Scaffold this active site. Structure first.
Site, mmCIF file in Angstrom:
data_model
loop_
_atom_site.group_PDB
_atom_site.id
_atom_site.type_symbol
_atom_site.label_atom_id
_atom_site.label_comp_id
_atom_site.label_asym_id
_atom_site.label_seq_id
_atom_site.Cartn_x
_atom_site.Cartn_y
_atom_site.Cartn_z
ATOM 1 N N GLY A 209 -11.472 120.617 3.497
ATOM 2 C CA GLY A 209 -11.727 121.442 4.652
ATOM 3 C C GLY A 209 -11.801 122.931 4.375
ATOM 4 O O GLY A 209 -12.206 123.695 5.274
ATOM 5 N N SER B 173 -13.642 123.824 1.738
ATOM 6 C CA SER B 173 -14.969 123.815 1.161
ATOM 7 C C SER B 173 -15.938 124.592 2.025
ATOM 8 O O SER B 173 -15.899 124.514 3.251
ATOM 9 C CB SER B 173 -15.465 122.381 1.031
ATOM 10 O OG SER B 173 -15.068 121.831 -0.230
ATOM 11 N N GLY B 174 -16.844 125.297 1.361
ATOM 12 C CA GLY B 174 -17.806 126.132 2.030
ATOM 13 C C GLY B 174 -17.327 127.531 2.305
ATOM 14 O O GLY B 174 -18.156 128.431 2.492
HETATM 15 S S1 LIG Z 1 -13.646 121.094 -0.521
HETATM 16 O O1 LIG Z 1 -13.311 121.518 -1.863
HETATM 17 O O2 LIG Z 1 -12.690 121.353 0.509
HETATM 18 C C1 LIG Z 1 -14.030 119.402 -0.524
HETATM 19 C C2 LIG Z 1 -12.802 118.694 -1.097
HETATM 20 C C3 LIG Z 1 -15.270 119.039 -1.351
HETATM 21 C C4 LIG Z 1 -14.195 118.983 0.976
HETATM 22 O O3 LIG Z 1 -13.253 118.520 1.596
HETATM 23 N N1 LIG Z 1 -15.430 119.224 1.451
HETATM 24 C C5 LIG Z 1 -15.546 118.881 2.880
HETATM 25 C C6 LIG Z 1 -16.737 118.032 3.119
HETATM 26 C C7 LIG Z 1 -17.626 118.124 4.211
HETATM 27 N N2 LIG Z 1 -18.521 117.126 4.032
HETATM 28 C C8 LIG Z 1 -19.634 116.710 4.911
HETATM 29 C C9 LIG Z 1 -19.116 115.767 5.961
HETATM 30 C C10 LIG Z 1 -18.766 114.450 5.621
HETATM 31 C C11 LIG Z 1 -18.324 113.572 6.616
HETATM 32 C C12 LIG Z 1 -18.237 114.045 7.923
HETATM 33 CL CL1 LIG Z 1 -17.697 112.978 9.141
HETATM 34 C C13 LIG Z 1 -18.576 115.341 8.262
HETATM 35 C C14 LIG Z 1 -19.017 116.197 7.276
HETATM 36 N N3 LIG Z 1 -18.185 116.467 2.860
HETATM 37 N N4 LIG Z 1 -17.119 117.006 2.318
#
Ligand SMILES: *S(=O)(=O)C(C)(C)C(=O)NCc1cn(Cc2ccc(Cl)cc2)nn1
Ligand code: NA
Length: 240
Positions: free
Chosen positions: A186, A188-189
């Protein structure tokens, strides 16, 4: 952010919350950085799922009205054309979101300052990660924006075998790895803010943490190196 402290309300006014629609409401999924009144910089992987997104600027407490938020839709998503969702370690984890309306700037909403193209930080440079991400590995999101001091780990160290090895590229910034403080799911980005010539600038876009845990010794949080993408960012903004 694991091992963080609660940020003061006006400290990081370029931080945004990227949220997606969940039922009748919204869920925070990623951070980002406001870089123009109508453009947000985030990670490409944050938009891998095709959902309705909104951006919140001026946010502090996700669960409570602070009286400072502006909520805006996302009108266009421009992912880096070399991004490969099945190969995060290749890099290119960056995307620009054109907002449906231009936000109003004030003490809670300001543009993030980007580094000069090509800038690489010396090892152990002073930086802070900010975000609402998990406060412990396998934990829950932070209600209020967190910050943690995460000094950089330079490429030679970070890409060595006892850290991330070949998974880290020179197009990334590593920071932290002290086993106590880190980015987490969370975050990320969102930004890595680094102090350079007396001014904080956004040198990183949070990209990944270790599968073995958020705060893991010698697995620093890894960020897309913003200064590798200045030309790309400017080209996108100028052509859209
Ligand atoms: S980041 O380093 O915090 C990391 C660990 C890669 C992370 O948690 N990224 C967050 C994230 C957002 N998404 C797209 C997504 C997937 C599923 C849903 Cl329901 C909404 C948005 N993938 N990882
Ligand atoms: Na709020």
């Amino acid at each position: 952010v694991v091992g963080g402290t609660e940020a003061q309300r006006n400290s990081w006014p370029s931080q945004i919350s990227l949220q997606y629609r969940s039922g009748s409401s919204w869920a925070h999924t990623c951070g980002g950085t406001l870089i123009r009144q109508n453009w947000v910089m985030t990670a490409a992987h944050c938009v891998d799922r095709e959902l309705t997104f909104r951006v919140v600027v001026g946010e502090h407490n996700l669960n409570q009205n602070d009286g400072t938020e502006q909520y805006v839709g996302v009108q266009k998503i421009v992912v880096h054309p070399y991004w490969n969702t099945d190969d995060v370690a290749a890099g290119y984890d960056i995307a620009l979101l054109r907002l449906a309306q231009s936000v109003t700037l004030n003490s809670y909403v300001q543009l993030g300052v980007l580094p000069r193209a090509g800038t690489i930080l010396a090892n152990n440079s002073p930086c802070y990660i900010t975000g609402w991400g998990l406060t412990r590995t396998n934990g829950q999101l932070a209600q209020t924006l967190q910050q943690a001091y995460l000094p950089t780990v330079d490429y030679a160290i970070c890409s060595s075998s006892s850290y991330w090895g070949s998974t880290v590229k020179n197009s990334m910034v590593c920071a932290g790895g002290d086993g106590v403080r880190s980015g987490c799911q969370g975050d990320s980005g969102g930004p890595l803010h680094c102090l350079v010539n007396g001014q904080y600038a956004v040198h990183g876009v949070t990209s990944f943490v270790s599968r073995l845990g958020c705060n893991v010794t010698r697995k620093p949080t890894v960020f897309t190196r913003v200064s590798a993408y200045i030309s790309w960012i400017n080209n996108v903004i100028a052509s859209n």
